[PDB]
UniProtKB/Swiss-Prot annotation, chains A, B:
<comment type="function">
    <text>Is required not only for elongation of protein synthesis but also for the initiation of all mRNA translation through initiator tRNA(fMet) aminoacylation.</text>
</comment>
<dbReference type="GO" id="GO:0046872">
    <property type="term" value="F:metal ion binding"/>
</dbReference>
<feature type="binding site">
    <location>
        <position position="156"/>
    </location>
    <ligand>
        <name>Zn(2+)</name>
    </ligand>
</feature>
<protein>
    <recommendedName>
        <fullName>Methionine--tRNA ligase</fullName>
        <ecNumber>6.1.1.10</ecNumber>
    </recommendedName>
</protein>
<keyword id="KW-0820">tRNA-binding</keyword>
<feature type="binding site">
    <location>
        <position position="143"/>
    </location>
    <ligand>
        <name>Zn(2+)</name>
    </ligand>
</feature>
<keyword id="KW-0436">Ligase</keyword>
<comment type="subunit">
    <text>Homodimer.</text>
</comment>
<dbReference type="GO" id="GO:0004825">
    <property type="term" value="F:methionine-tRNA ligase activity"/>
</dbReference>
<dbReference type="GO" id="GO:0005524">
    <property type="term" value="F:ATP binding"/>
</dbReference>
<dbReference type="GO" id="GO:0000049">
    <property type="term" value="F:tRNA binding"/>
</dbReference>
<keyword id="KW-0963">Cytoplasm</keyword>
<feature type="binding site">
    <location>
        <position position="146"/>
    </location>
    <ligand>
        <name>Zn(2+)</name>
    </ligand>
</feature>
<keyword id="KW-0067">ATP-binding</keyword>
<comment type="similarity">
    <text>Belongs to the class-I aminoacyl-tRNA synthetase family. MetG type 1 subfamily.</text>
</comment>
<keyword id="KW-0030">Aminoacyl-tRNA synthetase</keyword>
<dbReference type="GO" id="GO:0005829">
    <property type="term" value="C:cytosol"/>
</dbReference>
């Protein structure tokens, strides 16, 4: 019996998360883990904020704040956001945890000890007016492909994606604009080549899709250049070595980050009261823990190559309990990117769907539903507002919500909300109870295969099946002729609602508890279905979902989207709506300030 | 060995919580429970949203939304807010839980069964244009003391506090203004008189303060009028009785609400995996569970009289395990009200400090610190912005934060962050380690006595003691003469920081983890102090707290306070600040909209 150690790529504590992030590695992981829990399986779901690296440091000088100040701010912002998103991480830690410092440092020390490292002195950047080295994101120059002013790290705003700090033209320190200087420095490196073979061999015998497995093999087919794992940063985890040359140096966040996956788990079992249980999840003791890594496509290389090697370089974990080895990525589910109304998410262009903002106007189920509806699985998908409301209202409201409502509304009208007893069953009755079985079976398999968009579809169809059932069983007619008959229809219909109650859970937790209350159940939610007993008391018909409005979308676009990118807003607005309508919404939404918005989006209007 | 069943008054799901609420019953409870946990004691901390009652129903017709829609919205808003507030409820449920429905209904049925009830028909309100009864908050008329138009429930906006629905002049249904009608109805009542004696007797033998114990006794000294526990509402828990007269009737929220205290706990142990542990907390088995009820003064009567009786009326709980009785309120800590800048919190006047808004500009420690600083213990206290910043900056920043910073900054300057070994100890060294003991001892006692304002003070003084220590031990001098000496000072100083790390926890969780990371500790936080070992590696000097700004307060007042109550804002602004300063802050804070604010607060300015 396998147990599961599930993680989600650590979000960087330099900003808030957007739907691309969620759709990319959190929502999938949540859907998967919830399922596993309903299955009764043994799974741990971990995550936390990545709090080191040049960026965070950069931003600190930028806003004149300590790197600690900002990560403390974003850890809270993100942890709460995930709670809002209903992402059930068993624990959400942070790489600022003392234990992370200890484990990373050990990790590095284990690499020292197995001669997988190599000190090296290189000539590198510097500022004399600021008396400090100038790592990655401090580069401030022209581009490496196109030629634009001011380019940092490796993302751009031009065409540029990945522009090493040196291929940049006119190197000038970002902090003060002083043209860079060159001071040589010492850093330790990892002889990745030491694991190329062992890696390739391991990758061979593994259930990953060729589109990855292979491309990975290729990438390895040409040596692994010794990568540096140290940095000249004033923020981060100190390199253990007590020498004078390694003073004021830190472990490349690039190296310690993944170790966070273990650090946090350990932290989890500590505070949970069972200090040593973590060992069975990350250590290959009587080996059989499937370690899953939900990530974004960009993380495949790292997770299928370097991270595994970092683990190997620590050959032996060993004290007071088995000297076993670290497990390796069982699987590394990755998702493509997400676009917004035809364009890519852009923090620069301030064009994205921020979870915390979006969740201010729409319920979590809506964001979770639609996003799974467009899960960037095999390719990229495009978030669209017209697409969003239409799927919710047409699918979630008109179908799932509709069925549930009808069902209850009937058991309440003809039986005073008491579950009728079932008489003989004809073909449909027989087929309906079978469909319930089919769903549980198939949805479960689709999930274990990372086919969420299709898994959610299998569920919606069951609701679709329920509607049909009702539509052509006509309880409103049958009730004026054959009581017993209607009783069956009704009882059967509710069975489908209870089932839809458990099946939905992994996808929409809230619409799940909503249904459970309507059915009035204490029953611990589980994947093994059990019919609703006759004589069971159900609650009065409530509503499941309220249709998305244009008033809402406009309010959203105007209130968030707009200031940050007025043109983006304007283009969206007079693309879906008439200006005479937006004004009205704006007027009856922003009181004595509506006017100082409309003019802000529609360049000139007064 | 006692275990503790701690609760906080269920917040009503009709709106967000404000500092008065927090200061009144949540913050106290949190400080108490955290302590208990650090003490290693066995405590359960429960709470959830009260989701029934006329109000919620009212609001529903008001905004044309189902009562369920709104409670779902506020349960999320409040649960997240509490997370933001760092209130560690072991579980935050809701009275919409199926189990609540079951337990309440049983409770009522147990009262039926022990003849503590009495059906009665009364002539009551109605609307014929709306074909519905008109309970409490539907009353819409002139006042009962002063004479003002439109008065609902029992709170006012005039002078009025508690105006029974009938003493109101010109009774007109609130929904449509149609002057009320009178249709007789049947409701069950509880013969409170049946418990007067048994109550008074119980209250006698109990450790409550006379100012309560007595006033309670008086209140009881004149019969307990049979109170109605049923209602003509379409939203709520159905009365079990299957009769045609009790159809469409519900249990007065007033009756079921407290039962939520048990419902949720049960729900807690269910989902936690240990289904039956709840029995030992609410049932008096081998009796010794101290049940504490953190509430507001307004709740004393209810919690010391009716709630206990409701418990008695259920004489026997009994199946498959001991037929024991429900425990009774061990203690019922209550706090006075809170005022804002000299005036009372007012949802009507839109004058209050909303936790979720306030926590958008200031860290949770700041709100928790200041509020405990003004805990409405023996009387009412007044929240004030000048008072807020001054205490934070002068106390939290300049003292606690200052000490911590100095300490680390030294162990890092003269020992490369490594804990020095202690040599001979003189009087101060000896006294310093003793002070640490004293603090733990006294703070702990002050907490167990609900003396938080003083408990927090005992802690700040320890930090104050640390500063003095340092000030007159002069490490910066001693380091250029006697190494060993400085080592002691330093080692000692850090002991005080680690201690301040645990002591703070109950009050400021974040400044607590901040200190723990600086000290670089894995050690599970506990109330039993253990010195920092020599040779221990501490982190580089960070900052603990950033001083509150005027830019912040103005931004807050302008961004939240203002629209909702522009006059309130204006009066605050040009009372603390010059208009030429507010403008600047407003201009460099609201970009292209600053102008449409300043004019909104300062009536005319252009
Ligand atoms: Zn470029
Ligand atoms: Zn510079
Ligand atoms: Zn009045
Ligand atoms: Zn009316």
């Amino acid at each position: 019996m396998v147990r599961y150690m599930v993680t989600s790529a650590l979000p960087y504590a330099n900003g808030p998360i957007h739907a691309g992030h969620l759709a990319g590695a959190y929502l999938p992981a949540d859907i998967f883990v919830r399922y596993l829990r309903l299955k009764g399986e043994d799974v741990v779901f971990i995550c936390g904020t990545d709090e080191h690296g040049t960026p965070i440091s950069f931003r600190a000088l930028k806003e004149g704040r300590s790197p600690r100040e900002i990560v403390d701010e974003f850890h809270e912002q993100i942890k709460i956001t995930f709670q809002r998103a209903k992402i059930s991480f068993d624990f959400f830690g942070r790489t600022e945890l003392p234990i992370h410092y200890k484990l990373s440092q050990e990790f590095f020390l284990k690499a020292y000890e197995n001669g997988h490292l190599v000190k090296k002195v290189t000539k590198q950047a510097y500022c004399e007016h600021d008396k400090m080295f100038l790592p990655d994101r401090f580069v401030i120059g022209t581009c490496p492909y196109c030629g634009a002013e001011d380019q940092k790290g490796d993302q751009c705003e031009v065409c540029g994606r990945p522009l090493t700090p040196e291929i940049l033209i006119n190197p000038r320190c970002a902090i003060c604009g002083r043209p860079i200087s060159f001071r040589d420095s010492a850093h330790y490196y990892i002889k990745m080549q030491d694991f190329a073979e062992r890696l390739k061999r391991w990758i061979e015998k593994q259930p990953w899709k060729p589109n990855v497995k292979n491309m990975v093999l290729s990438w390895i087919e040409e040596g692994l250049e010794e990568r540096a794992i140290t940095r000249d940063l004033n923020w981060g985890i100190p390199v253990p070595l007590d020498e004078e040359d390694m003073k004021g140096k830190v472990l490349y966040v690039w190296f310690e980050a993944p170790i966070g996956y273990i650090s946090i788990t350990i932290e989890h079992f500590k505070r949970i009261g069972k200090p040593n249980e973590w060992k069975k999840y990350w250590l290959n003791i009587d080996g059989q823990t499937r370690v899953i890594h939900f990530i974004g496509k960009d993380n495949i290389p790292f997770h299928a190559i370097f991270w595994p090697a970092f683990l190997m370089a620590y050959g032996k974990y060993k004290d007071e309990e088995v000297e076993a080895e670290w497990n390796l990525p069982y699987d590394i589910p990755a998702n493509e990117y997400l676009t917004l109304e035809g364009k890519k998410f852009s923090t620069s262009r301030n064009w994205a769907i921020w979870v915390h903002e979006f969740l201010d106007v729409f319920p979590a189920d809506y964001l979770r539903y639609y996003l799974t509806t467009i899960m960037p699985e095999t390719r990229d998908s495009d978030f669209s507002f017209s697409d969003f409301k239409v799927r919710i209202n047409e699918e979630l409201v008109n179908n799932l919500g509709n069925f549930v409502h009808r069902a209850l509304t009937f058991v309440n009208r003809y039986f005073d909300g008491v579950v009728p007893e079932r008489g003989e069953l004809d073909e449909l009755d027989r087929e309906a109870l079978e469909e319930i079985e089919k769903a549980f079976k198939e949805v479960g398999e689709l999930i274990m295969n990372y086919r969420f968009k299709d898994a959610l579809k299998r569920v919606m169809s069951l609701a679709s099946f329920g509607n049909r059932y009702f539509d052509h069983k006509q309880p409103w007619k049958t009730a004026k002729e054959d009581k017993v008959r209607t009783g069956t229809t009704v009882n059967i219909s509710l069975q489908i609602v209870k089932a839809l109650g458990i099946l939905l859970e992994p996808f929409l937790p809230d619409a799940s508890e909503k249904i459970w209350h309507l059915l009035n159940l204490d029953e611990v939610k589980r994947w093994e279905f059990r019919e609703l007993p006759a004589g069971h008391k159900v609650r009065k018909p409530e509503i499941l979902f309220k249709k998305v409005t244009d008033d809402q979308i406009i309010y959203f676009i105007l209130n968030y989207m707009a200031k940050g990118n007025p043109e983006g807003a304007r283009i969206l607005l007079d693309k879906y709506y008439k200006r005479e309508d937006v004004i009205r919404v704006a007027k009856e939404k922003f009181g004595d300030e509506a006017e100082v918005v409309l003019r802000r989006v529609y360049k000139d209007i007064k």
